[model samples]
Target: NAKRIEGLDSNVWVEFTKLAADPSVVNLGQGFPDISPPSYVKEELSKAAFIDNMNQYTRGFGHPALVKALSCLYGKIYQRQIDPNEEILVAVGAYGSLFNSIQGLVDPGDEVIIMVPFYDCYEPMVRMAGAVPVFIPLRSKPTDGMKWTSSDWTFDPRELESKFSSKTKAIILNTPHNPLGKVYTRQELQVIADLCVKHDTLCISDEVYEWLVYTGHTHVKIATLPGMWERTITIGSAGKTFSVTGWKLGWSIGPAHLIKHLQTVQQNSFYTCATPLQAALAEAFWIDIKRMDDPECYFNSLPKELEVKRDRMVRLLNSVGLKPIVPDGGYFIIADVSSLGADLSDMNSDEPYDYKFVKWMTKHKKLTAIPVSAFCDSKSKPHFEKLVRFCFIKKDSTLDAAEEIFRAWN
Candidate 1:
């Protein structure tokens, strides 16, 4: 009910998902997978709900066991012995953790450098915290005759560094990035780290898609780069990790100095996340830690399985005439839909082309994807409105159904 509430009237997911709610629609619009999370997570949740005493409020910062498990798992990954009690703060989804970090650290009038084609929530969160969101686009360049993938979408080193200034409070990093699915290389991460270090800026690194990277490309954490551990808050999501987005469980891992502020935000806002889910995640994380390097671990195997879907989606898009910007990570694929070139003026007005295009495709073609403009700011929206984003972490039949709709159109 303040100035921040004025221009925040819409979320693309809410709008498009409402359109996708029609029973007849085969939706690839939102990010959720139409499949199971690991079976043991559910088993652990049931055990926590019925068999254990994790039904009530646990530790406000994080459930003890869950934090310990998180610390254990991430410590191994980060190559440091993380302090469970000091370094972890369990929050509701990566969304909540992002909220806590932004609100906790950012002051009014401060500028937050957000790389575009970013996760949409970052801008709104920064705005709500009375901070300014400075936009920097992840420019798409050619692969010089090689096959194009998401990795080709990158931030120009000078462009990124120029965005930082004395007014800059922080930069939000989403590796194995959203919308474009571009995984940030260690060199890129180091470049950003150097910029942040030079400017004395903090970083909120969103690694929610940390494990979704495809074969050959690896996810590099910005926080792990030199001088970044103290200045970065790394966000991780159980939902994204385990394919259980409905769980709404996520954590923030950072140095105690920064983590305490995020804890303050979580303590006042949600107080604590769901107890049973936290306990369940503890079990899941411990299980994952045991078999993390094994071939069959969900963390290892999910990307392997989703990579097949990624290839299939690319092939399907190719067969159907859309040029899919092949992703190295994440479930969604952004395809330039300009080739489709269906007139959608009659569908909707006063909106970006992609907004109307996907909705028009939904109502008429019986399938839909998210408009690419949804991920950008107003000025950048026009540049991206010709593209649409599709989710590939769906059942094969769902892909088949999408294919059928495209096939029918052809």
Candidate 2:
């Protein structure tokens, strides 16, 4: 019963959630926000729903209000003019844009370069398009008491340069990256830009957690880097932006020549995103985020709140001998669990140590988490064997429950 893309079964969150659904378990495996979206965004949606003629199918690319607001926001942040008409195409979410862009650009036997530990979807999507996945695992060095900054996840320029061959078609770049939570520096992106230019490869830049950066780390858009604008398709998500994953509103912005093909793919697959949510997003964009910087507003206050939660979780994990890689951005952090000695050497089971550990914890320790090995290639088992990933996007009560479980296990 294996289909053409049978090797694509890699959604770790789904597996973890099923185990955590048990009443005895306290879940920390997935990164979905337990909190609600900004009040203004939700208020706008409610207001729009009441308008006399609000229920209507928007003309494809996106509703006019959203396209204009997003373009204006991009202009302010990127200091570049984004033509609202042709440069943007709103898809179902970042997931949809990622799929369409890969399917549209990659031909059979072509190669797509991906960074690891990756988001898990790139490999399968690349394979589905009949392309080979060329992996460039992030180079990690021992921290010499430098507080282990995210800079440790740096890539070697020579290694990246060598990844591009005649058959290479694209490179997927995730800023404020998942799991490791490293935000690419300007110099780092410049090196990637130079490689893309040299190889004639396209860049798929996923900036879903753009605004969630912390501790002086900045999210650099690869599209804005030198030599990248013309060849990069920048992907954004309303789910991440507005904290409403269920809304599933996302978009792709790039030069028309490249994006036109993605549009063709979009039309063939999903003709349009849910029309009503697009309408709500349009209104959400106009509300001034700058006002939140005033001590009064909560949006500006959010990072500090999340930072405390992150540190609390970090402390709990550290107390139990699981050292966390303190993240500079995004919602996830990977903890090293080699101290626990789970006997990962030559396991007969298909499950990696982290996978077995998470499953065992759910049943015995009453806790849940994602295995770090899921983000790695099959060949990277030895290097990634004893790590697990946890998301700090839980309520205080949930965190308290998880802390108790960790205490008991310790």
Candidate 3:
């Protein structure tokens, strides 16, 4: 009955996930991996189960072991010492981390900037915070007959700057962005970083897919850029990091002044997460930190393995005559589905084409991928309707089933 929950009926997942939920559907509609996470997570979790104290309530902001590991691991990455107690707050998920950041920072009527084809929750979260979400679409232009990659998707710098004004409170930057899988380059990050510095806007940098960049593309944290650290809430997810999205563990790394507010929001809302999971994740962090650059480490090795999956997907989609906008980071691939020439008029006409197309594919074809328009605001939906998003962080069987669907469709 709250004003905050009004006008939020359109949850793409609630609709598409239901359609995909049929046992017969070969679904690629949701983002979670069908594959299991790293072995160490279970190993360490079992280890924590025997350690009695880990079963009890932990530090509200973050457990000591996890925060200590985070500080040690992130300190090296950031080239600065981290204050675990002051600068980090662990929440329910990357979703919760961003929730804390938005709720803790924004005041009523404050405007927050978000790029289109975003994580979808950013708009509603900002709205729930009583702030206006100002959207900027990541537009694509011709590349002289070149095959499109996610890097080709970009926003006009002038337009990004235009969104920043006197009442702007923050900007949500999703690197290795979801749905589109664009690993925003350091140069691209600098442009936004410069704006945040100039406008004094907070940068809620969602780097949940930070470690998922493909070969030759790097995951650059916007907080590392000069003058941006203090203004940035860099969020990362254990689920995304360890291929365990259901684990729902995530953290925000930022200056004490900013992170403190996030903790305040967490304390009053979701006070703490499971202690055993925190301890397990802490152990996982420690293992990775000691050999972060080592090829055997999950952080370094997972992407190398997934890149093969990404390439396989590209090839399969290409074989099926669909032109894929190959991803630079993250596992999702958003591709042009128009070449299929499937008639979607039988589906709900009021929805965007991509929406109808995906549902049509799911119902008749028993194959599913999400509509890219689901990630955009209504004003931005039309521009994205031709594209559908698919997740590649799946087992070969899953991808092969999708390939089967693609093969049968044409």
Candidate 4:
């Protein structure tokens, strides 16, 4: 077996989903919506499923309709004219798009800067590409005592700048970041853009949750920043965008020169995404564009609905002594379990604290969540071991079930 294969174990999601499979468990572990997508999208899928052409492979780079739709939607949002054929490359999912981008761009001995508590796949992808992942933790400064907000997590500019140098090939930026749900502000992104421009480093901006942002915060695409249009590749997901995780349609938008490499990678590997899904996604995105300003739009309604779920989970977790970091966007909420007084001393000493705590809670309390440490690098795992992340994209009844368990535990 290859050394790379040895370095990678089964993903944390795979492990946690298994624990979450117990019929009695109230799963808040994996980040997926338990509810169905908008009715229109479903109808579109049904229509496409029977279409003769849609049953076959589409374009190698992307389905023409989906790519065109993405280009138009992104152009409207970013205020830049994008070439559909040249700028966009669709893949199996955002995960595939990210892997292709990293594999195509990052070379051996090149150092890619990754923020700690990142999507767990980023590190392995970088290593598989024969690049080194340089990690920097997002340090926290909570203000309201035990109650923390995602805004409290910020990186030191000096520390971030120090990580960039001659060997730096790229940096992964996940706004409305996974697990933490921290949406980066324009100023914060600008600081990073300046560094990337200065070092001539590539920016792999993962904005899968772009449409899922909540009130009081905004999601900014780094590719829209000055000097970044050429160097940045912005990734988006139909799975996250339309709350249809099973669809697995995702794409990357960048300059023709850079996007060409990703296209080559796509051609070599999984050449085309599912044609029916792409046709359906094209319709879904077009609808989003037409109804963007309408409150009834799924793009508008999803975040609104998720905000209520976020609040409910926060209140329930807080009442049970698990201090949740109120998120501004995305489906995840990380709660500090330090105050819960869960005894983990009897668990495996090598396992992270929050991991042990979540296992105990899932088995005995009939609730499930992911330990926040799983998102962090080995060096920073201990620092985040006191936190666990919950996905609040479930039905209200699911949330109520979690609350019932919390009440009993309290």
Candidate 5:
């Protein structure tokens, strides 16, 4: 076996998804939505499917129409004119963009800073690039008595600054962060921008959840900060944006100096994304651009619908003795499950307490969620062992079913 592949075979999603496949399970394990994309998107995809040459490969860097649409849409958001040919490269998915960026830039023995609890793929991807992953966790505090907000999870400036050094090649920033769903404030991003400039580090900004923020919160792009545009590669996903995870399309935006490497990786690996999907996404983006201010637009309406589901999940979880950390953005919510009082002392397996609890819940209670510890580094897993993450991007009927399960448990 290749030494680098060690410990990569065992995955949190793989195991949980297997359990989720049981006919009796009400799976909220993976983050994909159970609902379909907007009707217009589907209509465009159908049109693309039947169009001549839509099945063939397009431009190696990206489809011409899609890249132009992305450039136009992002120009409005970032307040900067972008060159479609030089600044953007499309890939299989946001995961693909992340893989290409890390593999293309990181050298062996270089250190990359990752915050915990993170999206699980970040650590492994860093290792696969032969880089060392240096983890710094976001610590949480209670707010307004017993209720907690994702914004309460913050990093100490001293600790954060301490993590950066001359050997640091890059730092991964995920606003509207996974699991925690904490949208980094401008002040918070400024602190990171200052350090990266001080250390000459690269920023791999994952803004896949950029448009999913709820009321009273805003998603800020780190690359828009001073001095960061040159060093940051901003990643986004059409899958997350359009509620079509199966479409598997994503892109990265940055300066030609850095984006050239990613393009090289794309050329060598999956050279072009699916042609039909790209065409369909181009149409979807054009629609978003034309209806930017329309409340009925998919971009505007997705969060509005998800906010209602998030509230429903939070209320149900709280009533059943799970204390939820209300999120400011994204579809995921983390809840402290220590109140459920499960005994793990006698368990034979080496899994963390939360992992055992989730497995037990899936098998016995017919509900599935991901253990929050799975997103933490080994050293910090114990600290987050009482938490579990649930995806609230499901259909209302699915959310209602989960509520009924909790109601029965109570």
Candidate 6:
């Protein structure tokens, strides 16, 4: 498929999904909503189709309605004036935006610095662009018993400074970051912004989970920082933003010069997003942004619901003798499985703690989880071993089913 797309071999979601489909297996591996998108968004889509009668192909960039709505919404949120016509381009999804950005800017042998444990697609996307992925992993510090806070994961500022050489073309920054769920503070992003300015490097900001933060944690967009607006490609997803993953409406905001090149890449690959859905999505943004902070709002309610689910998954895993590294923002958390003494020989060629453990869990516990190593580069896996990631976004019934399996197995 697509010439094997070098360095794209590992997909934890695919692996976990297979196990989850088994009637006997309880899958906790993939990060997907068992819940549906908000009714406001769905209703808009229906309105576009039936009421507005929008069924034709939209402009190559996006439907004008969606673009205008996004400009207003994102402008309000990021506090930056984003031109609807020039700065934003709707993509198939955030994945599509990421792919287009890499293909657009990078050339063969260029180096893209990525933080670990990362989403699996970053590596392959770099390889397909003929660029090398330079990985700098977030070191998980020791924590007290069962506290499970995300504060333990830290990145050394000096270590990051040392990585920006002439070969560094771009850096992938995922805030409210995946797996570890470390929401980068404004101070931390300033350090990164300083490096980008010093090195003349580009920032690829993936902020799909921008709204899922919790308990006084705030998400800061890099472009809002000094000198960063010119170099950052800010990405967002309706799937993650509004719980509409299937709608595949994502977008990027940046300077027109950079976005122009990305649009070139997008034009050659997937041409545009769906027409009718874009019209509906626009309506959601215009109307829904106001309710986002209200107590009864789904945006407010989602994190509250997921937080309980996160606690439930944490207790279940802990009961099974696994210790979770608590996440502050996103829907997933990771746990150390070293104490399990499970069979991992099949998965680890050298150090297979994460791989073998997840596989074994799928087979024996009738539970599925993602191997943390799959997100890291070859050199970073050793330190990142003993970790497996679990998504806590399941329905209460789904989580209950998984918990029963964990109890029986444990």
Clash count per candidate: 0, 0, 0, 0, 0, 0
Which residue ranges in model 4 land beyond 4 Å of their true spot?
142-147
Instruction: Estimate, for each residue in 1-410, the C-alpha lDDT of model 4 and write its tens digit.
Output: 78766668768866765786679999989876888788988999999999999999889898899999998998998898999999999998899999889978989899999999999999999988888999999998756676578888889999999999999999999998998999999989999999999999999999999988888898899998999999999999988988889999899999999999999898998788889999999998898889889998888899998898888889999888888889878999999999878866688668888989988898889998899999999899989999999999898888888888988985
Q: TM-score of predicted model 2?
A: 0.93
Q: What's the lDDT for residue 205 in model 5?
A: 95
Per residue, candidate 2 scores C-alpha lDDT tens digits across 202-275 of 99999988877786787789888778889999999998877788898888888888888888898898786665
Provide the global lDDT of candidate 4 against the true structure: 0.90
Model 5 regions lying over 4 Å from their true place: 343-346
Superposed on all Cα atoms, the candidates' RMSDs to the truth, in angstroms, are 1.2, 2.3, 1.3, 1.3, 1.2, 2.3
Candidate 6 residue pairs that clash: none
Clashing pairs in 1: none
Ranking by lDDT: 5, 4, 1, 3, 6, 2
Over 4 Å off in model 1, which ranges? none
Best candidate, lDDT-wise? 5
| TM-score winner, 3 or 5 | 5
- TM-score for every candidate vs. truth? 0.97, 0.93, 0.97, 0.98, 0.98, 0.93
Model 1 TM:
0.97
User: Which pairs clash in the backbone of model 3?
Assistant: none
lDDT by candidate, in order shown = 0.88, 0.81, 0.88, 0.90, 0.91, 0.84
Residue 260 lDDT (model 2): 85
Candidate 5 per-residue C-alpha lDDT over 232-307 given as tens digits, one digit per residue, 9 for 90 to 100: 9999999899989999999999999999999999999978888999999999999888998999888899999989
Residue 124 displacement in candidate 4 (angstroms): 0.2
Candidate 6: tens digits of C-alpha lDDT, residues 275-297: 89888888878776777668767
